[PDB]
């Protein structure tokens, strides 16, 4: 269309944050120092996957509401192409309107990422059975992303904001059960013209 929706998303981290490293060379280079590296850029920043978290949040809440929304989290499941999340994030037939970025941090790894030590306390004897060192992202670290909706509808900002409140409720990535990833979001959207750069 002639308009596009830009949602600038700013994350402030409230709890410790972990998202594990996925590059095999970087992870294997970090296993000689930490047992759980943070997913990190080659420009020494931190990136978090964001499209899957928003899609999982919206699918859980819209399945709870009773809408006809598919579950693309099941093993090799195919999206049907008629859901609202299928229109937003994508389907096998057509791509999604929302173009979610990675959550690149505003700070370099030496300023927000710290190396911590977790243990396994035995139930009797209260001793350290196992001990592992993992990397984490500190509290107060700021991340930025831009969600880009190509064909905006009236319910695109509301569902993205509801999914962001669900991500604030449950956590963004990594060890969500132990208390990691509890964050907060600021949203500054703007409907920009598609022919803006031409001039």
Contact positions vs another protein (CB under 8 A): 2, 4, 6, 14, 22-26, 29, 32-33, 41-43, 47, 49-51, 73-78, 89-90, 93-96, 98-102, 104, 106, 108, 110-111, 145-146, 148, 150, 192-195
Nearest Cα to 115, choosing from 49, 182, 18, 25?
18
Using an 8 Å Cβ cutoff, are 7 and 149 in contact?
A: yes
In angstroms, the CA 55 to CA 38 distance is 22
Q: Phi and psi at residue 67, in whole multiples of 5°?
A: -75, 160
Q: Could you tell me which of 46, 62, 71, 53 has the C-alpha nearest to residue 168? A: 53
Q: Which residue has the tokens 């009797």?
A: 124
Q: Which does 174 bind (CB under 5 to 8 A by kind): Zn ion, another protein, a second copy, none?
A: none
The number of residues that bind Zn ion (CB under 5 A) is: 5
Instruction: Tell me if 22 sits within 8 A of 49, measured CB to CB.
Output: no
| Site for a second copy contains 115 (CB under 8 A) | yes
Among 18, 37, 59, 183, binds a second copy (CB under 8 A): 59
Interface of this chain with a second copy, residues 124 to 153, rule: CB under 8 A: 124-127, 129-130, 133, 136, 138-141, 145-146, 148, 150-151
- When asked if residue 170 is in the footprint of a second copy (CB under 8 A), the reply is yes
Binding interface with Zn ion (CB under 5 A): 70, 79-80, 83, 86
């Amino acid at each position: 269309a002639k308009t596009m929706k830009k949602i600038y998303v700013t994350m402030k981290t409230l709890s410790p944050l972990y998202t594990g490293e996925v590059r095999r060379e970087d992870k294997e280079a970090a296993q000689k120092r930490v047992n759980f590296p943070v997913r990190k850029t080659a420009t020494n920043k931190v990136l978090i996957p964001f499209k899957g978290a928003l899609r999982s949040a919206l699918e859980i809440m819209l399945k709870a509401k009773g809408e006809n929304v598919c579950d693309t989290g099941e093993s090799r499941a195919r999206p049907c192409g008629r859901c609202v999340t299928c229109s937003l994030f994508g389907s096998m037939g057509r791509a999604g309107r929302a173009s979610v970025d990675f959550l690149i941090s505003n700070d370099t790894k030496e300023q927000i990422v710290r190396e911590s030590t977790h243990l396994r306390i035995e139930r009797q004897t209260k001793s350290a059975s196992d001990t592992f060192k993992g990397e984490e992202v500190i509290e107060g670290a700021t991340f930025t992303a831009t969600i880009t909706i190509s064909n905006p509808q009236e319910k695109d900002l509301s569902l993205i904001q509801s999914a962001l409140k669900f991500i604030e409720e449950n956590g963004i990535g990594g060890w969500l059960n132990k208390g990691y990833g509890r964050v907060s979001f600021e949203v500054k959207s703007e409907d920009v013209a598609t022919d803006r750069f031409l001039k």
